[PDB]
Ligand binder design. Structure first.
Ligand SMILES: CC(=O)N[C@H]1[C@H]([C@H](O)[C@H](O)COC(C)=O)O[C@@](O[C@H](CO)[C@@H](O)[C@@H]2O[C@@](O)(C(=O)O)C[C@H](O)[C@H]2NC(C)=O)(C(=O)O)C[C@@H]1O
Ligand SMILES: *[C@@H]1O[C@H](CO)[C@@H](O[C@@H]2O[C@H](CO)[C@@H](O)[C@H](O)[C@H]2NC(C)=O)[C@H](O)[C@H]1NC(C)=O
Ligand SMILES: *[C@@H]1O[C@H](CO)[C@@H](O[C@@H]2O[C@H](CO)[C@@H](O)[C@H](O)[C@H]2NC(C)=O)[C@H](O)[C@H]1NC(C)=O
Ligand SMILES: *[C@@H]1O[C@H](CO)[C@@H](O[C@@H]2O[C@H](CO)[C@@H](O)[C@H](O)[C@H]2NC(C)=O)[C@H](O)[C@H]1NC(C)=O
Ligand SMILES: *[C@@H]1O[C@H](CO)[C@@H](O)[C@H](O)[C@H]1NC(C)=O
Ligand SMILES: *[C@@H]1O[C@H](CO)[C@@H](O)[C@H](O)[C@H]1NC(C)=O
Ligand SMILES: *[C@@H]1O[C@H](CO)[C@@H](O)[C@H](O)[C@H]1NC(C)=O
Lengths: 48, 129, 439, 96, 96, 48, 48
């Protein structure tokens, strides 16, 4: 299996843990929920 | 520290400031803290020839060993190191022109560090029951 | 109306309910060193900033006037709490816990300066330990900035950038001492904050003023006192769960932390310059172009400070309104009971108490709450004897044991009609029920 | 952070082709021969085989280039049982 | 704003430039329901917004509290009611 | 405008806080109007 | 074009700051007025 997808200059919300490992990420322009996640700089935005 | 991999030598905060580094030569890790910055709260009375200085939230040992050596007398108050003021927190005043905060005042005759009690209970010796 | 009578649900049983209300009377005294915020340590920035004139002097002057106004407001709130308070010198809270079966031990800390800062009550301790950033919280957080701790507290970063919160002129311990004095001033003689009468009698007279007969109140004094202390315990246990007042206090702290964090974040905005760091600009460009980049940062940071000062002026105006309302509630709900219906909380307001809270006062409104109701046929007036009209005082006329009697509007207890519970009229109005054989 | 990242919600394409003896000429045309543009992100399965219980790592080799002629450099990333040999040379690439 | 009308509403031009007025959380119809409920709470039993007594008696007792004897006040009840509803009609006609 | 920083985030935050204050105020006015109101189920708009 | 657009961005961002400041002051006046309306409801409509 050799899965490939194109790359592009994109803004991502990168979350780093206490040991410096990227545990989660969000593609800000991918969807409306991703836009809320990037606006609040949080993986799980507050209810609102 | 143990978070530096083979290709990493700099630690950054969320704002892009450098806050730590692993030395390239010695491999020793250090945390970078900004040099201390702050203000001095000076209490002045028109009838006085000097100032009563309050280094807010600092201990007198830190002010003397890391800011400046002075010939003025000093003590560690609740609000921080106080210079040129006599520690008299047991005494109290109903009026205060030099309000330091948290119920503390500077009173001049030398400056005295004194509690501020603007309001008092009218007491009576009548029976309670 | 059947004949001259209407159907009304009159209470047959009641309880006392307690309702909390946090009123913000103070705000964190934010101080900004405009010179250290805009330019940090960099001489090239200070030289440029000096060319803008008195911008930083104006920012410092507006923040000093705002902080002086907050200090004046806190002095006025403390003066209001201590106004007219007279206490016996023989009074000792370590032995005088409760009176007339009503327990105030949780609302009273030690009395007198010999206890130091221990004048905070159990209720106030339970309210203060849930808020980290009180006046003492800010003092401890700023004390830890030079303690050698490896933890990078955001308050320390803000203070090193010139954004620090000064403590209020009166410590929250002093305000708790004043609320404690105002609270004990209502339970013991001379009762200087309870209309000069015993607290249980004041509660009884207040419940009777709502339309409840004195007979049921003075025979149920133990039930009223237990309902009152159970309402107090319900208020206290209400903080262990999601509470509107505790959330309001934390909202004050969180709004301040968010404003301070937004102001600090303005230091990292580029404002169209090559970098937001003055060190990076000065380590890349010569003075002729470094001046162009530093000017954009100065303009952006001065605009940010002006916006923050304008917002702070508006927020402090809201705090002045809240403090004026809190002083009015102390005067018209705690020290006395003004004839205003929903001013001291909703419902049939009996009496109110006050406790200290982070950046404000917690009001405890005790209300008369009906439990069970009875549908009865009532008459709003009667035409008696020689066509003389009578109207009921804080009650209604009812038919009980086929006789005309009076009952209070807030408690069903038929009692004989007399001049004590009647307004006389020389002529009875039309539609008043005809009762020729009454009196 | 702004960098060269995949579009979230887009589709990965499994371009790996396994054969035994025959090679199809259609395997060496579109859509297999893809445009590079800014770049690509690849998720590759390590097809762990076994010979006499001894584990061996095998996966598809990728080439990146333009015309694939010996007057132009072609990047080749080829695995060799735990060694990833990466070269960029003026290779005489075969037709297939 | 999405209609084919030649008259361009200035509110549409403002909204297309990011300036828009959102509706309040409670509709004015709901607030009108609340004011209607608060108004009918004074005219009928249990008179929850009129001190627990009929509205005409509340008007009479309020006028008597100003220093007016109950005699002329309960003998002129129709004149008082007509004066009251005429005052209300005067308020309504004042908007024209 | 993205290079300018958090200026637009601050403008949106101040307007959102202002609108939250208006919403809270409208709820308090409605609560004040509805406070203690008790009506009979027999009330009808057409006959009374 | 960046220089011209930056001049427009500064002007339009100053315009928003000025409008936001006016809106904060006006909403404070509305809150004072709404508290007065609630006080008038409680002390003139529900009681005298
Ligand atoms: C992209 C693709 O389509 N890839 C598949 C491949 C081709 O479709 C096939 O090559 C068509 O031919 C062309 C390319 O022209 O088929 C594979 O499966 C075969 C059956 O399709 C497989 O079973 C083979 O069957 C044999 O009869 C024969 O020679 O094909 C005997 C041989 O010993 C045996 N190989 C073994 C045992 O691996 C394969 O492998 O080749 C699986 C691959 O995923
Ligand atoms: C600092 O850390 C690096 C990385 O761990 C060390 O470099 C390795 O040293 C060993 C022994 O000399 C070599 O086998 C490796 O090839 C080196 N490089 C890497 C990337 O592992 C280095 O020895 C440490 N100390 C100093 C003084 O540099
Ligand atoms: C500043 O002076 C005060 C005056 O009260 C000192 O407080 C002492 O507190 C202890 C514990 O309550 C008492 O036993 C002492 O009697 C107090 N001292 C005096 C002189 O009465 C406080 O410790 C002083 N602080 C410093 C750093 O000098
Ligand atoms: C009437 O006076 C008596 C005291 O003579 C009060 O009784 C005390 O009440 C307190 C508070 O509940 C108790 O802690 C004491 O133990 C009681 N003492 C005795 C001797 O009974 C009583 O509460 C008063 N009642 C009222 C309503 O005033
Ligand atoms: C300060 O000096 C003035 C003028 O001599 C005098 O009136 C005042 O009492 C003095 N106050 C103190 C605290 O010394
Ligand atoms: C009133 O209610 C309480 C709690 O339900 C009950 O203990 C008490 O007996 C009731 N009294 C009457 C007179 O109904
Ligand atoms: C201050 O630091 C001490 C020691 O690290 C810690 O115990 C204390 O909880 C800290 N307090 C605050 C408010 O940071």
């Amino acid at each position: 299996q050799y899965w490939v997808t194109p790359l592009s200059k994109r803004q991502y919300l990168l979350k780093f843990d206490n040991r410096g490992v990227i545990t989660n990420a969000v593609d800000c322009s991918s969807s409306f929920f991703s836009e809320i996640q990037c606006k609040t700089k949080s993986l799980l935005p507050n209810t609102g | 520290a143990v978070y530096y991999n083979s290709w990493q030598n700099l630690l950054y905060d969320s704002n892009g400031n450098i806050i730590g580094f692993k030395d390239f030569v010695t491999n020793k890790t250090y945390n970078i803290f900004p040099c201390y910055a702050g203000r001095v709260s000076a209490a002045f009375h028109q009838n006085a020839s000097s100032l009563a200085l309050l280094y807010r939230n600092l201990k007198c040992s830190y002010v003397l060993n890391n800011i400046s050596l002075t010939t003025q007398p000093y003590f560690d108050s609740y609000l921080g190191c106080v210079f040129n003021a006599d520690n008299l927190t047991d005494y109290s005043v109903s009026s205060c022109a030099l309000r330091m905060g948290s119920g503390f005042c500077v009173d001049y005759n030398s400056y005295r560090f004194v509690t501020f009690e603007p309001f008092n209970v009218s007491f009576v010796n009548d029976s309670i029951e | 109306s059947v004949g001259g009578l209407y159907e009304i649900k009159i209470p047959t049983n009641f309880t006392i309910v307690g309702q909390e209300e946090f009123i913000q009377t103070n705000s964190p005294k934010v101080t900004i060193d405009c010179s250290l915020f805009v330019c940090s340590n960099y001489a090239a920035c200070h030289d440029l900033l000096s060319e803008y004139g008195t911008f930083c002097d104006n920012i410092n002057s507006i923040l000093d006037e705002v902080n002086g106004l907050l200090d004046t407001t806190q002095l006025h709130v403390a003066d209001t709490l201590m106004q007219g308070v007279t206490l016996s010198s023989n009074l000792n809270t370590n032995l005088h816990f409760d009176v007339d079966n009503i327990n105030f031990k949780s609302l009273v800390g030690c009395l007198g300066p010999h206890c130091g800062s221990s004048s905070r009550s159990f209720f106030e301790d339970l309210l203060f330990d849930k808020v980290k950033l009180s006046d003492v919280g800010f003092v401890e957080a700023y004390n830890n900035c030079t303690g050698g701790s490896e933890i990078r507290d955001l308050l320390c970063v803000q203070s090193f950038n010139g954004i620090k919160v000064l403590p209020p002129i009166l410590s929250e311990s002093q305000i708790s001492g004043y609320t404690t004095a105002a609270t004990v001033a209502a339970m013991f003689p001379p009762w200087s904050a309870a209309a000069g009468i015993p607290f249980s009698l004041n509660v009884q007279y207040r419940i009777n003023g709502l339309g409840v007969t004195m007979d049921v109140l003075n025979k149920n004094q133990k039930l009223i006192a237990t309902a009152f202390n159970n309402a107090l315990l319900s208020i206290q246990n209400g903080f262990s769960a999601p509470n509107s007042a505790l959330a309001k206090i934390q909202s004050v702290v969180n709004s301040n932390a968010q404003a301070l964090n937004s102001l600090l974040q303005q230091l990292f905005n580029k404002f169209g310059a090559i970098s937001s760091s003055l060190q990076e600009i000065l380590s890349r460009l010569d003075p002729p172009e470094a001046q162009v980049q530093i000017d954009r940062l100065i303009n952006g940071r001065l605009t940010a400070l002006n916006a923050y000062v304008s917002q702070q002026l508006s927020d402090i105006s809201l705090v002045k309104f809240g403090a004026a309302l809190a002083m009015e509630k102390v005067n018209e709900c705690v020290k006395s009971q003004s004839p205003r219906i929903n001013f001291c909380g909703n419902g049939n307001h009996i009496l109110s108490l006050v406790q200290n809270a982070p950046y404000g006062l917690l009001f405890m409104h005790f209300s008369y709450k009906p439990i069970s109701f009875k549908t009865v046929l009532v008459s709003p007036g009667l035409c008696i004897s020689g066509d003389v009209g009578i109207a009921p005082k804080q009650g209604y006329f009812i038919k009980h044991n086929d006789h005309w009697m009076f009952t209070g509007s807030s408690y069903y207890y038929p009692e004989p009609i007399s001049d004590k519970n009647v307004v006389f009229m020389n002529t009875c109005s039309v539609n008043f029920t005809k009762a020729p054989l009454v009196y | 952070f702004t960098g060269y990242f995949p579009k979230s919600g887009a589709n990965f394409r499994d371009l790996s082709l396994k054969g035994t003896t025959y090679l199809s000429t259609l395997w060496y045309q579109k859509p297999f021969l893809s445009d590079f543009n800014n770049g690509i992100f690849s998720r590759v399965k390590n097809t762990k085989l076994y010979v006499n219980k001894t584990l061996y790592s095998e996966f598809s080799t990728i080439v990146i280039g333009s015309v694939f002629i010996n007057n132009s450099y072609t990047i080749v990333v080829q695995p060799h049982n735990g060694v990833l040999e990466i070269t960029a040379c003026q290779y005489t690439m075969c037709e297939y």
